[PDB]
User: Which sequence fits this backbone?
């Protein structure tokens, strides 16, 4: 059908700065390029119609222009409430096609993880299960490596992380990390450690425990 | 306002109507000639209690609200006044909308009677688009 | 004012047929042009087709001829019907109006031959191990369910003040995700909290315990 190429992929910006997203349709599709916004956990919303026709009840920070191939939407004096994704959609030809999207991130201040461990729950051992869990809540920036040590050293593939989208509060993050092993490879050891190293420090946040049991 | 063939021709183009969903710019410039004389103000009641409005003469039934028609179903959410204006944004926008339902330009009679299937290129020749 | 709320199943078998609906309330339907849009896992949206006044329909070729949008005016709603479903068809379908002036919550739809399994809700109890500010963080675990999504709420919407529900991660044909809550440090055993999960389509409402205890 007809494609639109949204550049740039992501954008991490500093509250008060001006940004600008592009959308290149491989066709003349003159003037019928409309922008939506899809903020974490919801259905999109129209920002600007046709090209520069601003919808009502939308910030004066939003501005759109263009016609022809080259189309752009500019966010002036960004706000924390502007984290979300922006797609474009032509309606010039059928089928109506959407863009790659652009995740605009809000530059918070450097903040550090708050590590937390939890040994395999009781009732989970019964099964013959055993899930060690590691909560590394509320950080920024998105980067961060987490290692797991059972007794002395490092683990591997039994690992199971799960990050979140920036937070609708203070552009903070938070990720998870589950370790899953059977009951008989659980207690062949005693010391489980969930170390993490972030930008925030020059030394790991070390949250451990030893199976000192029930 | 009363547009000059070329004038309108270009303003349409500027309103992204050239090939808007299959129809060459010509079809627009033409359909407004025969349907309103290129007169944003034109207005002609439909015996049926309805009224027409502007350049492409949008109807008072399924498109805008005159508060003089009850069936009134404002597909285009625009108060008809808005169609009489110096600014055709309004008018275009709703056109862009009508023309999106399989009857495309057949919605426009003059277009269907006198415009349709004529070398429409005509309408946009001599212009400085 | 005008509200559209899509409904239908959570899951159907491949090469079966999925039927959804989008009850439109408040505003009239009589002719406003409506649509269907799907958002796939890779977060990229795709327009299905639409219904314009008359009963003129148009449909994204991408989507074979498996579709059939249609409406019911007396019952003010319109439906969607993707025939010969398949894996790829796994996404979240939404219903709109011409532009996208208005939308709906969205409804997740899975196309897998695997089958529905209730969750196993496990409690994450704090150790005795300290922290860098006496602020007690509890968690709960929801392992082995199908399909998604689930509704984990701490002490029924009461505990709002600070949780984190991480998106899930599939275990080769079966899902597991977690949730944590951060509260006033003891303020622990003395308030008693509980993860209130919910497998919408398993039709299982688990009540689960997390009284900051220790073996």
Assistant:
């Amino acid at each position: 059908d007809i494609v639109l190429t949204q550049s740039p992929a992501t954008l991490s910006v500093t509250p008060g700065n001006s940004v600008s997203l592009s959308c290149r349709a491989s066709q003349s599709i003159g003037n019928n390029l409309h922008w939506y916004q899809q903020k974490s956990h919801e259905s999109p919303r129209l920002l600007i119609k046709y090209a520069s026709q601003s919808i009502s009840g939308i910030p004066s920070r939003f501005s759109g222009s263009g016609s022809g191939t080259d189309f752009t939407l500019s966010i002036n004096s960004v706000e924390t409430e502007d984290f979300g994704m922006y797609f474009c959609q032509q309606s010039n030809s059928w089928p109506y096609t959407f863009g790659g999207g652009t995740k605009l991130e809000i530059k918070r201040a450097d903040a550090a993880p708050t590590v937390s461990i939890f040994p395999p729950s009781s009732e989970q051992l019964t099964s013959g299960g055993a899930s060690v869990v590691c909560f590394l809540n509320n950080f920024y920036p998105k980067d961060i490596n987490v290692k797991w040590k059972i007794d002395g050293s490092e683990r591997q593939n039994g690992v199971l992380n799960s990050w979140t989208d920036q937070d609708s509060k203070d552009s903070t993050y938070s990720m998870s990390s589950t370790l899953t092993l059977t009951k008989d490879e659980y207690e062949r050891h005693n010391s489980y450690t969930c170390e993490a190293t972030h930008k925030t420090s020059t030394s790991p946040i070390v949250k451990s425990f030893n199976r000192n049991e029930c | 306002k009363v547009f000059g063939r070329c004038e309108l021709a270009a303003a349409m183009k500027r309103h992204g109507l050239d090939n808007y969903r299959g129809y060459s710019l010509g079809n627009w410039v033409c359909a407004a000639k025969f349907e309103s004389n290129f007169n944003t103000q034109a207005t002609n009641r439909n015996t049926d209690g309805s009224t027409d409005y502007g350049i492409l003469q949008i109807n008072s039934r399924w498109w805008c609200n005159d508060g003089r028609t009850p069936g009134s179903r404002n597909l285009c959410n625009i108060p008809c006044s808005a169609l009489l204006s110096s600014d055709i944004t309004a008018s275009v926008n709703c056109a862009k909308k009508i023309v999106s339902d399989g009857n495309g330009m057949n919605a426009w009679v003059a277009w269907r009677n006198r415009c349709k299937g004529t070398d429409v290129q005509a309408w946009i020749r001599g212009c400085r688009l | 004012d005008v509200q559209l709320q899509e409904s239908g199943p959570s899951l159907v078998k491949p090469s079966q047929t999925l039927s959804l609906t989008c009850s439109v309330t408040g505003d009239s339907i009589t002719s406003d042009y409506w649509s269907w849009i799907r958002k796939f896992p890779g977060n990229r949206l795709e327009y299905m087709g639409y219904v314009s006044y008359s009963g003129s329909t148009y449909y994204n070729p991408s989507l074979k001829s498996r579709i059939s949008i249609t409406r019911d005016t007396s019952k003010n709603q319109y439906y969607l019907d993707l025939n010969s479903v398949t894996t790829e068809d796994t996404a979240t379908y939404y219903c709109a109006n011409w532009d996208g002036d208005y939308w709906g919550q969205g409804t997740l739809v899975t196309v897998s031959a695997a089958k529905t399994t209730p969750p196993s809700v496990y409690p994450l109890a704090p150790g005795s191990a300290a922290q860098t500010n006496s602020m007690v963080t509890l968690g709960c675990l929801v392992k082995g369910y199908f399909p998604e999504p689930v509704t984990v709420t701490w002490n029924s919407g009461s505990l709002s003040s600070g949780v984190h529900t991480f998106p899930a991660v599939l275990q080769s044909d079966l899902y597991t995700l977690s949730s944590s809550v951060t509260v006033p440090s003891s303020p622990r055993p003395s308030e008693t909290v509980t993860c209130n999960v919910a497998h919408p389509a398993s039709s299982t409402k688990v009540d689960k315990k997390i009284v900051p205890r220790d073996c």
The first strand of chain A starts at residue 4 and ends at 7. The helical segments of chain A are 122-127. Chain A touches chain B through 14 residues (CB under 8 Å). Chain A has two domains: 1-108, 109-211.
